[PDB]
Design a protein around this ligand. Structure first.
Ligand SMILES: O=[N+]([O-])c1ccc(O)cc1
Ligand SMILES: O=[N+]([O-])c1ccc(O)cc1
Ligand SMILES: O=[N+]([O-])c1ccc(O)cc1
Lengths: 565, 565, 565
């Protein structure tokens, strides 16, 4: 006779590059039956200023891979890796030279600037040299949206007419998934073919890969289209689940809870409206699923929130999917679909993030088009963070009331413009998460800020904002903000994320759509860590899209020492 | 438009036959956005003596299926189905006629008797008419074993010779998976294509489907070759995991623990023997895996038990594992593979069942070729139930001591033949499980009984046996047996299972290979429930293989009221 | 909403990179409904000495791709492409900048020298700057041979023994498929995933990709494992066929005939020997298949030739699959398999090439281990080119008789050593093809030359040889040879190919295993064009394997002007 397997590299087994076939900048030292412990891997920096990646490897990981996982390699390079372990009581060490191949972008056309996304290091404060950022971004396919769910024909529709479309199947794009270091070097790549295949028409491999979130095992969950997934940093696909049969179009978020369930954001397919028309709803249902893929619970936001509230919907930039700048004019006859509009079957909610509150078994949601809400297990709204306009009772009564640091009311109008105050609500926001501090962090994008469009486009800004909410009193306090004073070059109309980092007291942030509207120019995704105390920029690194006017979604601050438990 | 969906059947949605495509005797009533509770389904008996199937359906199931699951239909029949629920405070009911199609056996040749396996009802006591039994059996493929793992050429092999085989990839067969009622009617069918494709050479769809065991959710786990699965009674494949890369050939058992992990019985691929030869080991590794498919723990039994103990291995009938009746003659040069013999790389252990003891976080194993053992989390042998011959210390010290009802020693020779006692050990046994009564139940097949083959071939018998084990005192008491008087006609040389049933105080049993050796005759799988108090037969039902000399593996007593939580 | 398709690049449609997903150095100009003709593509050289690629594109091709195919790009480059056409009677032209991504080797481990195979230009005579060579080579997988066909157990086999293996499933390797120009630049890449997947165990995607041959449509056929294929230079898979059910292990060759059939080299699975043992035969059956994949005819070489002739088998180097140099010692008990040996079920023939003779509807075959034969449609041997030793009558009588240029006998012994002559037969040869001149060209590797091994290994040589055969007279004349005087650095123990090129009167050659035995060093594949008249080297380019001691198979001289008819 046959062909023999790769022989052992040093004192353990062979060193296999990309063992699972989905992560070309990873390798695996085969255990070859050796019994080892206290394992440590070091991938050495490339060149003078190269960043070292170092981490321990737990027993579960050794057993699962039947080997030592090597993460952090450079592409097209003779990587220098050192592995240390204990065996038979003796301290042991190998040095390996691990050659890798190239990263490939499988989705290129005449719009392509080049094959890969360009990185630009702007600032790296001392003590932040080690940081790694996983970038959850995407690259247009050549055909664009090619598929639609079939809906139910309207009684007001023409007789001869073919049936209409429904839902959001066209929300489909190729993934571009990498880890960048503080030298702007790619230190990880998820093969696009892992989950996606834009050239075939198997809907099982279609959609928009999003909601990459760490699990308690140091692995990650993600959603794409009609499936949700779990994978690890070796590129192993640990779970692949079809959505339960009543739901469709999972986007924006997936998060594992402490109870072993996963919270997902979906639409309801064959949702029967009161007028008896069936639609796939848009971005307005939350599932709680177990690791069998079964449904533990479901929140139907069309019966919990108010799908008729157009206070923010009517104030939005129509160019946040040609018609950029233009404030959106809602129409009463907008066909059902992924279109700005009120009511089930239209994009009335656009929920884009989820946070689980273990304290009361509730969920905090970010509704791009309505605000931020806590919904209980009981399916009742517990609080709302939003300008007060448009909210009828009983919901109006759940609105949180702004207060200062002494606890005294702040006066704001129904558009969320406050007086004599830095306090402002959030507008078309993302990532309404619970920080390790005990507060709510939000990325406040700021489109439709104060429920209008400004005179000039350049007048828009985004903020990293933090709130202290007292649920008993029903008060909200703004306790931290950053970015308002950075102007249009810090403005992300869409996507984006923040997360408080306690290890170094920074606010991590990724603005995913800076300069989205500069026709013909790469879009900018900006990674930041901002010192929480001083507001000094500790890290700033820009990612530039590989095609013009191509947004990014999110980024994560990833830690090698958690990757392989 | 195109083609409309099926319209609603009654007062809910359409009634969809076999929604997942894997269970043709199931249907689903679509929720069509109705909000319902107190759901109960009744599938009416066919004809005068027809068995009725009735069960409640929980919220998670309604949510997961987006509908009411209909279980228990007859093939090719106008089934009469009644669904009852509450909706808007009001008691509701619909009556449905659910036409079903045929059960298909996709694996037939000149050996086939007919397409399906025949049933023969022997006895059904009053009060046992409702009982349903899931039969885990199999049917030969036209080509037989077509594939081998490649191993490592041995230094004693011919210079010119191709490399040898290793492992147990030939342990491959089509499944035949059904539920039988006490009228002998098929009331469920798992499509053979669910997990298996014997005509293609995709090893992902090969193996021997076994270890069908219920989970805490009313669903089931199973193993087939290089994957493990979870499925439900609607035929929904809930999990599908590849085995971790270090392991191969999962057979015989899979059982979920209270900790949400699954225990599996595998081999180790690329196992480096002391002589430096690499083999895939046989049926001698235990995995604990999580629902991410990750390895939580492993027990390497080649370092835990004694792979050179041939006390039982040498006493076996060659015919099991038409050289039947012939006592196995072990050879020092038996080539590595699925072959009777000592050492890592041969079938020295053939472990065929697992039980988790949550009291001390240990595992109880049935080794067909050595006995029954408890092994701790700490990888130490806690006890052995086996004849004393062949055991060296440290392990001999772990042998449990036979005692009577007053705790006085029973006297047994090294072959396990006891004096003046009903006590006997188990030989080539199966399903060493923990009963609800706090005892150890075992199917004592009885091949190589008292460590020899008998004077004449038919001088063999099987037993349902139960033991009480005092682990502190190191003693074992036989507290119940059955079948020793039923002779060769109740002898299953292989496979089989028992399980105590607390609800009706019976011992359930399935003897899977009665008359295996009757050349040209169908093999008998005998389902039994034996009254624990009186030893009276409450149920006896025979299943006959659809080709001669074709073993069954196991059966389960299934309960519809647990199926859809 | 949706995402729009790539917009038009210039005056036709978008320019799509790698439209089919299998050829990353190709692109397609979408026709966007334009009606065009007289199409011409030019990919401009990169840098000062860069080679231009230019070709016409036929109407069939425009219609098939619905666009203009762009072949010849460089990796990771802003390629400059010019497209010219006629439309509405007007001459038209576009210049495009076509960015490409990287080539990836998905199969790397500690043996890897680097990711790609290194090229070394040695000689490019004036007028040969434009030449392109498709290299059919391979790269070891990390696991090596992992799978075996299961065979039939021997009556002389041990009782307890698992069954044996049979056939040649382990003949399995990752492909490395590229076109090189005369600057040593990669100008085409077939994605390894097109046909192969070494990490999965789907045998449908396993084997050894070989027999890449041009079709009358300017496309190519190839075999891998249990399938045969057709593909074009855009990476489109045009045919994928399973082998007919009675055959297995297709290797070495595929060639389309003028009758629309394809000639393949296979083994027979479940071949019943006279002793009643069933085997998969090795490399000794020819199929003629149509484009439906049906069997038009079959030549069973075990009943046509002599499977017992060991004249050459006994003279071979055992190191041509550790035991290199050593002359092979045939044994009477060599287990059946891909092992040197006599009889059906062993590697007695090793047929490695096929040529169809349309003049008499016969096939010329290269038997590595027996010589070169013509076999008629009638299944009768028409002639044999081989040393005379070992050939019994009736076959001995078919041996061709050596003659000089006047037509007078050359005296040679039974080992093929001739006297006073440059004439020599071929030994372990390849590619016995019909040239455009009307002669038989062979690559004469020269292992076991004159039916022995020499005193010293370095004494071996390879030849490009040509013969003029008169079938009526039964004479063979050596009319051209090259390479004997180039010594060990031109010696290919295995693989390799020649083909006469009439356009420039050269003999093209690819020696695929130069330095195979230099342990630890890359293997050398040498591309040559040798002037037929002067014997001057017009082209010489070396390809170095990416792992040590990793042979190449073949290479093709490819012509862009034929690629897109
Ligand atoms: O247009 N886009 O790519 C978008 C728009 C909105 C969104 O939430 C994500 C992506
Ligand atoms: O032959 N068989 O099918 C068998 C043999 C052994 C076993 O444990 C299960 C099934
Ligand atoms: O060892 N090898 O790789 C080989 C040997 C012989 C052959 O015909 C092709 C490949």
């Amino acid at each position: 006779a046959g062909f023999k397997p790769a022989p052992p590299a040093g004192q353990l087994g062979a060193v296999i590059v990309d063992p699972y076939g989905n992560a070309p900048l990873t390798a695996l030292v085969d255990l070859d039956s050796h019994v080892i412990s206290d394992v440590k891997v070091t991938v050495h920096g490339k060149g003078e200023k190269g960043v070292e990646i170092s981490y321990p490897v737990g027993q579960e990981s050794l057993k699962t891979y039947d080997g030592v996982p090597i993460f952090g390699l450079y592409q097209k390079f003779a990587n220098k890796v050192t592995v240390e372990w204990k065996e038979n009581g003796k301290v042991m060490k190998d040095d390996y030279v691990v050659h890798t191949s190239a990263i490939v972008n499988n989705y290129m056309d005449n719009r392509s600037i080049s094959d890969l996304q360009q990185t630009k290091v702007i600032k790296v404060a001392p003590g932040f040299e080690d940081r790694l950022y996983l970038v959850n971004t995407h690259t247009f396919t050549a055909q664009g949206s090619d598929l639609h769910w079939h809906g139910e024909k309207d009684k007001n529709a023409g007789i001869l007419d073919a049936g209409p479309a429904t839902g959001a199947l066209p929300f489909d794009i190729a993934p571009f998934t990498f880890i960048v270091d503080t030298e702007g070097e790619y230190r990880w790549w998820l093969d696009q073919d892992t989950f996606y295949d834009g050239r075939d028409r198997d809907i099982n491999k279609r959609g928009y890969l999003m909601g990459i979130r760490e699990t308690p095992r140091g692995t990650f969950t993600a959603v794409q289209g009609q499936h949700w997934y779990e994978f690890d940093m070796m590129g192993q696909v640990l779970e692949d689940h079809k959505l339960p049969r009543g739901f469709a179009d999972a986007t924006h978020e997936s998060i594992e809870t402490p109870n072993g369930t996963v919270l997902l954001r979906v639409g309801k397919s064959n949702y029967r409206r009161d007028d008896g028309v069936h639609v796939t709803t848009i971005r307005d249902h939350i599932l709680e699923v177990d690791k069998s893929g079964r449904v533990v619970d479901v929140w139907d936001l069309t019966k919990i929130l108010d799908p008729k509230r157009d206070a923010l919907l009517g104030a939005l930039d129509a160019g946040a999917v040609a018609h950029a700048g233009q404030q959106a004019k809602l129409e009463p006859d907008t066909p059902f679909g992924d279109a700005l509009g009120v009511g089930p079957g239209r994009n009335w909610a656009h929920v884009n993030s989820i946070a689980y509150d273990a304290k009361d078994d509730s969920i905090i949601l970010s509704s791009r088009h309505q605000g931020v809400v806590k919904i209980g297990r009981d399916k009742q709204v517990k609080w709302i963070l939003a300008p007060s306009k448009g909210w009828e009772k009983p919901l109006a009564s759940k609105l949180l009331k702004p207060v200062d640091a002494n606890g005294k009311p702040i006066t704001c109008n129904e558009n969320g413009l406050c007086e004599n105050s830095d306090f402002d609500f959030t507008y078309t926001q993302h990532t309404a998460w619970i920080s390790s501090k005990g507060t709510l962090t939000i990325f406040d994008n700021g489109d439709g800020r104060h429920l209008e469009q400004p005179a000039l486009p350049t007048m828009k800004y985004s903020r990293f904002v933090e709130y202290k909410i007292d649920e008993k009193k029903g008060t909200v306090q703004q306790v931290w903000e950053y970015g308002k004073e950075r102007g249009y070059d810090f403005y992300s109309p869409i996507t984006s994320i923040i997360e408080y980092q306690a290890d170094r007291n920074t606010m991590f942030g990724f603005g995913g759509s800076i300069h989205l509207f500069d026709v013909g120019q790469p879009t900018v995704g900006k990674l930041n860590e901002i010192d929480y105390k001083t507001k000094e920029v500790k890290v700033e690194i820009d990612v530039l899209s590989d095609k013009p006017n191509q947004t990014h979604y999110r980024a994560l601050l990833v830690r090698p020492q958690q990757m392989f438990k």
